[PDB]
Amino acid sequence: SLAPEDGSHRPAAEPTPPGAQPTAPGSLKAPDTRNEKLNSLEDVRKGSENYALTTNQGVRIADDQNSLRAGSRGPTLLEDFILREKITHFDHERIPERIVHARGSAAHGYFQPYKSLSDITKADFLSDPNKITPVFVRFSTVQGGAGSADTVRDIRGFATKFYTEEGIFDLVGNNTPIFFIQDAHKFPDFVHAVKPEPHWAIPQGQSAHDTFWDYVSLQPETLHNVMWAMSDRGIPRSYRTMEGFGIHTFRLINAEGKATFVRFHWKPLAGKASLVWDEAQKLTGRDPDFHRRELWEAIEAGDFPEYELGFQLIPEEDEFKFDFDLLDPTKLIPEELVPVQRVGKMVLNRNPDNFFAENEQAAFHPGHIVPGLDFTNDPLLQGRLYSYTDTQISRLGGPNFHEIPINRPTCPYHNFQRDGMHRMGIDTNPANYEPNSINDNWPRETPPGPKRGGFESYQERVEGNKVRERSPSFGEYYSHPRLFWLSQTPFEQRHIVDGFSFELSKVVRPYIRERVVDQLAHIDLTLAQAVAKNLGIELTDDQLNITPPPDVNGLKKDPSLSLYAIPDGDVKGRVVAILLNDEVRSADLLAILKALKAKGVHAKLLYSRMGEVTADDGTVLPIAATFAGAPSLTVDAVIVPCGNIADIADNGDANYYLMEAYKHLKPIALAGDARKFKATIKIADQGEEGIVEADSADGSFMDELLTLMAAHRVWSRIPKIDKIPA
Amino acid sequence: SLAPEDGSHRPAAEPTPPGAQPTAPGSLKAPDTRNEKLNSLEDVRKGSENYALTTNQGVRIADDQNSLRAGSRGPTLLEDFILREKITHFDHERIPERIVHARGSAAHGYFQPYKSLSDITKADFLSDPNKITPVFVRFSTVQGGAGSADTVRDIRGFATKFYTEEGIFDLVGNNTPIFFIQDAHKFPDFVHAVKPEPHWAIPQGQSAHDTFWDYVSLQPETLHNVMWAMSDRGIPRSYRTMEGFGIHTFRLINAEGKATFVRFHWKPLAGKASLVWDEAQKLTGRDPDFHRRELWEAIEAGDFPEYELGFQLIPEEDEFKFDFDLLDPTKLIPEELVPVQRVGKMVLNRNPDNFFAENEQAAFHPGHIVPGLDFTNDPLLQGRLYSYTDTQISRLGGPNFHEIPINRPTCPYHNFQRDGMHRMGIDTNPANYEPNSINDNWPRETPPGPKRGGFESYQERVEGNKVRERSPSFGEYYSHPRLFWLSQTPFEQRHIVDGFSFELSKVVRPYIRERVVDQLAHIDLTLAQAVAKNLGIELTDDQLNITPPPDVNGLKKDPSLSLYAIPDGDVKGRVVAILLNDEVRSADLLAILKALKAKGVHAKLLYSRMGEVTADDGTVLPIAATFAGAPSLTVDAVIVPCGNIADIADNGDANYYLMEAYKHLKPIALAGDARKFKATIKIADQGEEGIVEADSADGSFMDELLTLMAAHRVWSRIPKIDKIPA
Numbered sequence A, B: 001s002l003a004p005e006d007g008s009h010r011p012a013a014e015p016t017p018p019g020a021q022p023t024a025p026g027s028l029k030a031p032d033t034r035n036e037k038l039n040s041l042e043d044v045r046k047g048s049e050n051y052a053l054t055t056n057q058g059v060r061i062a063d064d065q066n067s068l069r070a071g072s073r074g075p076t077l078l079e080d081f082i083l084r085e086k087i088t089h090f091d092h093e094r095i096p097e098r099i100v101h102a103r104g105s106a107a108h109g110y111f112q113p114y115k116s117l118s119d120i121t122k123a124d125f126l127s128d129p130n131k132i133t134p135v136f137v138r139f140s141t142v143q144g145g146a147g148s149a150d151t152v153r154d155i156r157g158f159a160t161k162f163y164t165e166e167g168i169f170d171l172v173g174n175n176t177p178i179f180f181i182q183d184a185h186k187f188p189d190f191v192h193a194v195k196p197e198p199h200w201a202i203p204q205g206q207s208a209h210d211t212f213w214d215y216v217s218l219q220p221e222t223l224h225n226v227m228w229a230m231s232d233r234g235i236p237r238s239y240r241t242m243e244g245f246g247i248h249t250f251r252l253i254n255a256e257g258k259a260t261f262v263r264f265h266w267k268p269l270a271g272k273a274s275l276v277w278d279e280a281q282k283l284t285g286r287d288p289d290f291h292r293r294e295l296w297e298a299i300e301a302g303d304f305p306e307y308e309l310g311f312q313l314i315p316e317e318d319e320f321k322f323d324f325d326l327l328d329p330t331k332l333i334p335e336e337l338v339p340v341q342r343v344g345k346m347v348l349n350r351n352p353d354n355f356f357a358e359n360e361q362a363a364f365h366p367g368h369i370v371p372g373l374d375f376t377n378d379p380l381l382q383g384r385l386y387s388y389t390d391t392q393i394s395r396l397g398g399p400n401f402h403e404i405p406i407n408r409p410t411c412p413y414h415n416f417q418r419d420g421m422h423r424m425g426i427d428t429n430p431a432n433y434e435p436n437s438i439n440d441n442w443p444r445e446t447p448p449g450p451k452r453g454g455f456e457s458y459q460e461r462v463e464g465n466k467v468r469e470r471s472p473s474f475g476e477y478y479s480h481p482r483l484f485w486l487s488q489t490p491f492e493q494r495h496i497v498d499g500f501s502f503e504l505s506k507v508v509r510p511y512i513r514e515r516v517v518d519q520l521a522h523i524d525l526t527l528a529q530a531v532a533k534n535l536g537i538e539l540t541d542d543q544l545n546i547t548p549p550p551d552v553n554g555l556k557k558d559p560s561l562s563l564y565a566i567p568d569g570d571v572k573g574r575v576v577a578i579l580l581n582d583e584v585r586s587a588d589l590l591a592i593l594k595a596l597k598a599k600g601v602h603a604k605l606l607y608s609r610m611g612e613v614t615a616d617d618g619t620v621l622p623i624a625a626t627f628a629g630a631p632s633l634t635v636d637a638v639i640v641p642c643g644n645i646a647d648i649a650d651n652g653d654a655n656y657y658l659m660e661a662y663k664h665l666k667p668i669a670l671a672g673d674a675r676k677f678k679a680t681i682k683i684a685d686q687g688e689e690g691i692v693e694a695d696s697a698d699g700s701f702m703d704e705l706l707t708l709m710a711a712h713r714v715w716s717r718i719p720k721i722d723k724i725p726a
C-alpha cells in the first residue's frame, strides 16, 4: 500500500477544470462517454488493479527489483529470463516518427450531419442526420520532431478518420486553405528545405533559416502559403481556435452519377484566435506541450472541441469560370465567390487511454475515400495517393497496420490478402484468390449502387500526351497572396510584416533576404517596403514600379480570410490568472470566481509560493502555481483582487507578470488597491481601453473584463507596447 | 536559380568566429583537418558540384519539377519511375530514435596520452604518448526526443568512441559521477517514470511531473543523482564547460595480469560553467538548438572542445576500504580520498558532414572494451552489457550496424559471422566456421599477451548462491547527497533549493511533494526546510529530529563537487553582445574589439533592425541580429559603446536586453553616454560590482570586464535581482 489512505492519488471520474485533478487515461476519466469505435476497443484495453505482475508469457514475478546474480555482489547471470524480457522490450520501444507532422495530439469524438446530402453525394455517413459516425482526430505541426514544441510558427495538420459503415474515410487537411507547392514531385525538395539543415540538424520547429527562404525565393508558387504562415494563422492559441481545410478540390458523386466539385472546411465553434509571436516563442520554452495540454484539459473539463464541416460546391460546368485553376492547391476559392455550405458537426469528447498505442500508431491517408467521394487531377493530391500507404509500412512495421486497434474499421472487412509481418487475423477461407469455386467465390464483388455498393471511379475524360509539364493555368503566383494581404486588419498586416522581418533576419546569407524582398514587391509595395525597412534594405526604382497583380475575380478583399475582421469570440474554455496576496479581499474573489464560472471561464490562483493563503474573512485559498511557475503566457487575461497589496507590490515576478500580459495585449483587471500596479504598466490616472479598474470587483467590473475577453486581445494597445522593456 | 555573382553563398574554408559565415559540412569547412578515421570515410563521402542529377540507379533526370501526367492537367501515371523512387526514398527517411539520449550533438577529434600507462594497463591506446587515436564524441540529454530542446534541466551524456589499433573502445558516460539507480532491472521503471507520462505524452524534456517524483520518493537510492540534477550541474552553459564520468568502477589489466580498479573522468579545459534556471528555461524557447549550435560554431572558430582524461585508481586490496561499496553506481569516490590522475588529452576539431549519417547512426556501447580493460560486478554496468547491442538492432536495422561507416573500426576485423540485413562485406573465405581445415583455420584465435593479444577476462573469484538480492552494502542513500550539498557554495545551495521547489510545485498530487520533502529531511534539515517553505509545507517535530547521515570517510565537504568554489574560468570562446546605435563612437568600438580579440572572446553586433549602421568614422558595421532576435540569453556579457545613445535610450528591447542580462548575473559594461542605461537596472551611481562603467572604453574598462567574465557570473548581485521586473 503505497497510495495515500485519503485516495487523493486518483482523479474523480467527472468533468473537472484544468489543474483541479491529475489528468488520466480517457476510459478512467470518462468511463461513460462511449461511441461505436471506443466500444470496439474494449477487446484490447488492459487494466491493472488487483492483478499480479507477470512476464509477457504470464509467469508471475516475485522480485522486480533485482537481477539474478551469483552472490548478492556477484556477476549477473544469463539465465535471468525475467530481466532479459523486461530489458528487451524496453530496448525496442521506439518506432520511426512520421516523416512530416511528427508532433501531434489526438482525441476521439463523433460526427453527425445536419441533413441528408443524398442529392449531392451517396456517401453513407452524410445520408441521415440521425447517423452518428465515430471519429479520431490528430492535430499536428509540420516540421518539428515528435519531441519538438507546440507553439512554434508553422502550418498545422488537422486529420480526421471517420469510421463509417461503408469504410474508413480519412480527411487529411491543414489549417490554411492552400499548400506551398503545386506538384508532389517537389514535396521532398520543399520538405528538405524547411526541415533542419542536413550538416548540423538545426533549426528545430522553425522555417527561419537559409534553406527555407532560399527555396521560397526560387519558387514563387510558395508565396501564398508563406503569407499565411507569416500571419498570426501560423501561431494559433489552441487547436480548438483554428480553421481546417482539405485544400484540394475533390468530387462528390451522387446516386445518379452526377459529380460536383467540393472543397472541405472545418469551422471552429470556439472562434478563431491566435497568439502573438513573442508570446508564442517564449511559450515554446515555458511550456513546449501547451497545445497538447490545452486539448486534453479542455476535453477533461467538458469544453469539447467542436467544429462544423462545410463544403464549397462548384458544378462541373463552372470548372473554368475563375481566374485561377480549381486544381491548383496554391489557390484558394474565396468565400465571397463560393460560400461554405454547412454540412454537420464534429465534437471531440474523449481523450485516448495510451498515447503511443492510439495517437503515435494511428495512420491517416487521403486515399482512404468511400463511395460517394472521388478524386480530381490536382497534381499534388495525385502524388499524395502514392505516399501514405508506403510510409505506413516502414513506420508501423508491415502491411497489417490496419489491424492495429486504432486503425481498424468498425464495419466488415474481408478479402484475399494474407500474411505479412504481425498478421493478427486468422483466415478460415479455403480460398485465398478469386475467382474461386472452392468457397463459391466469397467474399464477392458488389456492383455500384445508391447504398452499400462497390466503389467505381467517376469516368472523367482524359486527353493529352504523356508529359512532365506544369499546366500554364498554374503559372500565376502573386494575386492570391495579395488578396490575403488586403483582407487582413491593420494590426494583422503589422504582424505579417514582423513575421517576415524576424524570419529573414535569421537568414545568414544577405542576398537571400534581398531576393525575398523582391518577391514581396511583386505582391504589395507597402508590405515590401515595411519588411525592407526592418532589414536595412532599400527598394530600387524598378522594384518601386512593379505593377500589382490583378484582383481575384474582381475582389480586392475577402474578410473571411482575416482571423479577426468579423468578431466570432467565445470565452468558454479560456483561463484567467488571479494574482493573490496574503490577505485577499474575499468579497472581490467571490464576485470574480463566480462570474468566470457562469461563463465557463477557468481560473488559476497564483502566489509567490505553493500551499495555501488565508483571505480577510478566514477563507483558505489553495494555490495552483507560482507567478514564475504558470507565467502570463499560459492565460488569456489577468485579474488582481484587492487585499494586502504591499505583499506583492515589490515582487519582481508579480510586476513582470503584468508587464508580460500587457505587452502581449491581454486584458488586465485591477480592483481596489491593486490599481497601484497601474504604475508598473504606466497606465494614466483616467485609465485606458483594455484595463478594467474599479474600487471593487463588483457591479460592472467582471462584465467589462469578460467583454474584453470576448474580443481576445486589446489591439489598440499595440502602439503603446512598443516602448515598455518586457 | 543560381548562386550570387559575388560568391557570398559559400563559407570560407578557414576558421571564422560564430556568425561571420554560414556554417558548412566539416569536410568543406576544414578540408585540411585530417585523422585516420576521417580519411577512412572518404570511400563514402559524396560530392555534388559539376555532377548531373540522377536517380539512385544512375539515370540522368531531365525534369525534376513535374510528375508524368496524361496531359498537363491530367492524372499522374504509374510509369513515372523517377517520381516513384524520389517519393519512396523520402517516405522511408526516418529511423527509430535512441530509447534514451535521443537528443545529441557530435564531433570528430583525437586523443593521446601524456605518458605510457603500461605499468597499469596493456591497452594499446594508452601505451605511447606519440600514438594518436581518433575519436568520435556525442553529447546528449537523457529524457527528451531527438527534436526536443538543448538547455533543459537533465543529466547529460558524454559518449566517446576511441578507434584504437586493437579495437573500438566506447567510454559511454554522463556529466555527473553517479547514476540514479543501483540495478539495471529498474532501468525501464526509472526511465518510464522520468519520460512523458503514458496517457498524454507530457512533459517533454522535463522531470517536473508527478511520476518522476513519485518514483524518487519511493526509491531513495535516486536521491544522490537527483541532487546533482537539481543543482546548476543540470543546466550546463556548453558541452565544452561540463565534466564527464564513466560512473562505474572498471578494471585496468597490465601485462603481468595485475588488476587495478579505475573510475574514468573527463575534465573540461574550458572550465566548468552553467546557466541559471530562468535563463536556461527561456533559452529552450528562444534557441532550442543552443548547445548543438555552440559546439558546431566553437569547432568552426578553432575554439576546439578540449578535455583531460583522468583516472581514479584503487588497488585491488583496497576494494572494501571505504564506507560505501565501490561497485555501487549511486556512490561517488571523493577526490579528497582518491585523486584523479591525469592520463591524456582529447581535442574535438572537426564537425561531421551529414548529421544523420554520422551522428544519428553512430552506435556507442560500454561492452566495447579492449585488452587491458575489464568489467566489474557493478550490477548496473552488468545489465548495460545486454542492452546496447540488442537496441542497435531495431534502431539501425540489423546486425551489420558495425559496417555503417561512422561505426567501422579502422583496425582489421575478420571472423566467421555472415549475412544479416544490409550486409556490405563480401566474404571470400571458403570457410564460415572454425575449426576448419579448408582455409587452414584462418582467421585464427590469438593467445593473450602483453601487446596485440587476444582478449581474456580477469579471473575474478565468484562465490555465492544464485539470488535476486541487493547487496546490504548498497542500502545507504543519504550520506552522498549530504556530502554534495555541503560542498556547494551558498549561491549554489540556493539554486538547488530553487530547483527542487520549482519542480515539486509542478507535481499535481500534494502528497508526493510532502514525501520528497520527508526524504530531503533525511539529507539536511536546512535544505528540507528551505524547500518546504517554498511549498507551504511545515516540517513535523519528528522530521526536525531526524539524525543527519554520517560523513563520508570523515569528510565534511569536498570542493571538487562544486562548479564554482575553486576558480577555473577561461574566457576563450565566450561571446559578448555589443548593442550598437546609429552613430557608434568608433574609438570605443576599436578598444572593445581589440581587447576581446586578445583573449579569444567573440562579439555579436546587435541593433534594432538588420543591415548596416555607419560609425562616427565611416566604418560600415554589419548587424548580426536584432536585440529581440539574439537575446541576452545567448551571450556571456553585454557591452554598450557610446555614440548617439538617444537612438536606443528609449528602445524597449534594448532596455529589456540589459534587464534580462542583469537578472541572469551577467557582466554589463557601459561607456560614455551609455551610462544613462544604469537607470533601467535601477541601481547605484557610485557603481556596483558587476557593472563596468567609464567615460570611454579602453584598456582599464576592458580589463575589468574581462576579469568579470573570467568569474562567469556576478553572484553578489543575487540578493538585488528578486525586485527586478524581468
Ligand code: HEM
Binding pocket: A097, A098, A099, A100, A101, A104, A138, A139, A140, A156, A157, A158, A159, A172, A173, A174, A178, A179, A183, A184, A187, A246, A247, A248, A329, A362, A363, A364, A380, A383, A384, A387, A388, A391, A392, A395, B087, B091
Ligand atoms: C495539401 C497538401 C497536404 C496536406 C494538407 C497534408 C496533410 C498531412 C497531415 C495532416 C499529416 C499527418 C497525419 C497524421 O496526423 O498522422 C500528413 C502526413 C504525411 N504526409 Fe501529407 N499533406 C499534404 C501533402 C503531402 C504530399 C504531396 C506528400 C508526399 C507526396 C505527403 C506525404 C506525407 C507523409 C509521408 C506523411 C506521414 C504519414 C504517416 O506516417 O502516417 N503529404 N500530411
Ligand code: HEM
Binding pocket: A087, A091, B097, B098, B099, B100, B101, B104, B138, B139, B140, B156, B157, B158, B159, B172, B173, B174, B178, B179, B183, B184, B187, B246, B247, B248, B329, B362, B363, B364, B380, B383, B384, B387, B388, B391, B392, B395
Ligand atoms: C551509469 C549509467 C549509465 C550511463 C552513464 C549511460 C549512458 C548513456 C549514454 C551517454 C547514451 C547515449 C550514447 C549515444 O550518444 O548514442 C546511452 C544510450 C543507451 N543506454 Fe545507457 N547509460 C547508463 C545506464 C543504462 C542502463 C542501466 C541501460 C539499460 C539496461 C541503458 C540502456 C541504454 C540504451 C538502450 C541506449 C540507446 C543506445 C542506442 O540506441 O544506441 N543505459 N546511455
